[PDB]
Amino acid sequence: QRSTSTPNVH
Amino acid sequence: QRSTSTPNVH
Amino acid sequence: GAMGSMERASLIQKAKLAEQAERYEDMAAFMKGAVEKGEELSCEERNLLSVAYKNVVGGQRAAWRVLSSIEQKSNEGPEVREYREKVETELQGVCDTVLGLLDSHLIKEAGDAESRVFYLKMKGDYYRYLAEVATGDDKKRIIDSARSAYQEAMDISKKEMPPTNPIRLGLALNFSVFHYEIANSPEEAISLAKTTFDEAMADLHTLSEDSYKDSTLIMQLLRDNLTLWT
Amino acid sequence: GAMGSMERASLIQKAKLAEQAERYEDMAAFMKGAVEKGEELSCEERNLLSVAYKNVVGGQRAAWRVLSSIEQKSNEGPEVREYREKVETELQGVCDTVLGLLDSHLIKEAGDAESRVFYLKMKGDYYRYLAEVATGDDKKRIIDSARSAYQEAMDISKKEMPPTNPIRLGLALNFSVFHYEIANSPEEAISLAKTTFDEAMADLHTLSEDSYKDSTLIMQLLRDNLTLWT
Ligand SMILES: *CC(=O)N1CC2(C1)CN(S(=O)(=O)c1ccc(Br)c(F)c1)CCO2
Numbered sequence: 001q002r003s004t005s006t007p008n009v010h
Numbered sequence: 011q012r013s014t015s016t017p018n019v020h
Numbered sequence: 021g022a023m024g025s026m027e028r029a030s031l032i033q034k035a036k037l038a039e040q041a042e043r044y045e046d047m048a049a050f051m052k053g054a055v056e057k058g059e060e061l062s063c064e065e066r067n068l069l070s071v072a073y074k075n076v077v078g079g080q081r082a083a084w085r086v087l088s089s090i091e092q093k094s095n096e097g098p099e100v101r102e103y104r105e106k107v108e109t110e111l112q113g114v115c116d117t118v119l120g121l122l123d124s125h126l127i128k129e130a131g132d133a134e135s136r137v138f139y140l141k142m143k144g145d146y147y148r149y150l151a152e153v154a155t156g157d158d159k160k161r162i163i164d165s166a167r168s169a170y171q172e173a174m175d176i177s178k179k180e181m182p183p184t185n186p187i188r189l190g191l192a193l194n195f196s197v198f199h200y201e202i203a204n205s206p207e208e209a210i211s212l213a214k215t216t217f218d219e220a221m222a223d224l225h226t227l228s229e230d231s232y233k234d235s236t237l238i239m240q241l242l243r244d245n246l247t248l249w250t
Numbered sequence: 251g252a253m254g255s256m257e258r259a260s261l262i263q264k265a266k267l268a269e270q271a272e273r274y275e276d277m278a279a280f281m282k283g284a285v286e287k288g289e290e291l292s293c294e295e296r297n298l299l300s301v302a303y304k305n306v307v308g309g310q311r312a313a314w315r316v317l318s319s320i321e322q323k324s325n326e327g328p329e330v331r332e333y334r335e336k337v338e339t340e341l342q343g344v345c346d347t348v349l350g351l352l353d354s355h356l357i358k359e360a361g362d363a364e365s366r367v368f369y370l371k372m373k374g375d376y377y378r379y380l381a382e383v384a385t386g387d388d389k390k391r392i393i394d395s396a397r398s399a400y401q402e403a404m405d406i407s408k409k410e411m412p413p414t415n416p417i418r419l420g421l422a423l424n425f426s427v428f429h430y431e432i433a434n435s436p437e438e439a440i441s442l443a444k445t446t447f448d449e450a451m452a453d454l455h456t457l458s459e460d461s462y463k464d465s466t467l468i469m470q471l472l473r474d475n476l477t478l479w480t
């Protein structure tokens with residue numbers, strides 16, 4: 001599995 | 011609600 | 021064109037890669053280049069062409085509907101109208117590209133019933149998409165061109181295809197949507213959708229091993245529209 | 251540029267419409283035009299810029315990963331490599347556009363801590379995206395440029411922001427991903443992510459009324475990466 005980075009929001 | 015047309019497939 | 025130097029088989033192969041990568045503008049560009057080689061498209065290749073352009077124009081139609089709703093609700097600065105017009109022009113350009121490929125390369129008197137019905141169905145669809153955003157003397161020309169293409173397709177499909185054939189079913193589904201949403205003919209739409217479903221059901225044994233899942237999907241969508249419309 | 255004749259406020263307004271319509275290439279184009287007016291961007295406008303370009307480059311990264319996996323698995327015609335190179339070049343072009351806007355217009359010595367940390371975080375991210383597809387003497391230059399930008403951002407954020415600030419948290423999250431996925435430093439990544447989560451938790455009372463949902467989201471993502479990494 002791939003690491004999670006900051007997502008899109010708002 | 012909107013009518014449904016032929017969808018994308020395959 | 022930009023694709024003129026690539027071999028037809030490489031263009032098909034890259035359209036399949038673009039589909040896998042969800043790059044539908046690329047995949048439409050590859051398929052247009054393939055069409056421009058001037059050879060017929062197989063069923064599988066017609067599906068690639070269809071999937072690519074439907075994805076492209078579908079995203080533009082969805083965007084146009086959002087902007088149009090924002091626009092109408094602010095009719096209760098020029099920026100909303102300007103941006104809706106921008107997306108509109110782009111959508112029209114894509115429909116013009118598809119309709120040009122159909123007329124220049126794909127629609128003809130020869131070929132099997134599937135190809136002829138499929139391309140005429142396509143022509144009806146992309147005129148219908150133009151009709152969704154049209155207004156003036158453009159709009160009458162467009163709506164009749166859609167109905168005309170759908171009618172040719174219907175005549176051929178009723179003569180040459182079993183009533184469960186998925187192209188014939190999908191064509192009838194899309195013609196009934198034209199009637200309801202574009203032509204203000206709800207009764208024609210319910211009538212066509214009802215006849216189509218009932219006739220497929222009456223000759224259910226004509227389902228094909230290689231496409232019955234598609235057929236039964238469209239008959240369920242005919243039933244959903246009938247439920248919605250009644 | 252193509253946007254030079256439009257008023258800044260109209261460009262912002264159209265970026266918001268493009269976001270609503272899920273037209274992220276348009277919305278990136280509008281925000282680039284806004285940036286090119288040469289005035290600072292508010293927090294809300296930085297978010298518009300971020301959302302637009304992240305959506306664009308995210309779709310290209312997803313496509314590149316699909317094509318790269320098809321490519322590697324066929325290393326076990328030239329078409330897969332050619333198309334992966336095409337998507338690669340486009341992704342690089344978008345990262346170059348973002349990194350050029352950061353250097354030409356957005357990164358500076360003045361401004362509040364949020365803006366300075368946010369843009370330096372952005373610079374680290376888009377170098378990291380270039381690093382995901384790089385190979386040669388280009389690749390060393392790129393990886394150090396990413397680490398360098400992230401480090402500047404970290405230094406400022408630790409001095410000027412509370413440990414729950416969502417920009418500081420998102421920066422640390424993204425730096426730890428750099429360590430793990432790009433720099434082959436799992437221990438630095440677990441260390442940074444652990445310190446960041448624990449320090450936010452230790453000073454949980456510094457959560458802000460207007461952004462605590464964002465803060466607590468990033469701390470959960472820090473925890474998810476820690477779980478994945480251990
Ligand atoms: C064999 C052939 O010519 N095909 C074109 C094809 C397969 C069919 N369509 S369609 O007729 O628009 C259609 C789409 C989706 C379903 Br579930 C269906 F039953 C028919 C589109 C392109 O693929």
Ligand SMILES: *CC(=O)N1CC2(C1)CN(S(=O)(=O)c1ccc(Br)c(F)c1)CCO2
Binds near residue numbers: 296300301365
């Ligand atoms: C106020 C400001 O400068 N902002 C930029 C902003 C809001 C924050 N980011 S971020 O720091 O990358 C980030 C993104 C998503 C979450 Br849940 C988060 F906590 C921080 C992106 C653009 O909006």
Ligand SMILES: [Cl-]
Binds near residue numbers: 102103106264
């Ligand atoms: Cl516009």
Ligand SMILES: [Cl-]
Binds near residue numbers: 034332333336
């Ligand atoms: Cl290519």
Ligand SMILES: [Mg+2]
Binds near residue numbers: 027
């Ligand atoms: Mg040759």
Ligand SMILES: [Mg+2]
Binds near residue numbers: 105108109
């Ligand atoms: Mg117009």
Ligand SMILES: [Mg+2]
Binds near residue numbers: 257
């Ligand atoms: Mg002025």
Ligand SMILES: [Mg+2]
Binds near residue numbers: 339
């Ligand atoms: Mg390259």
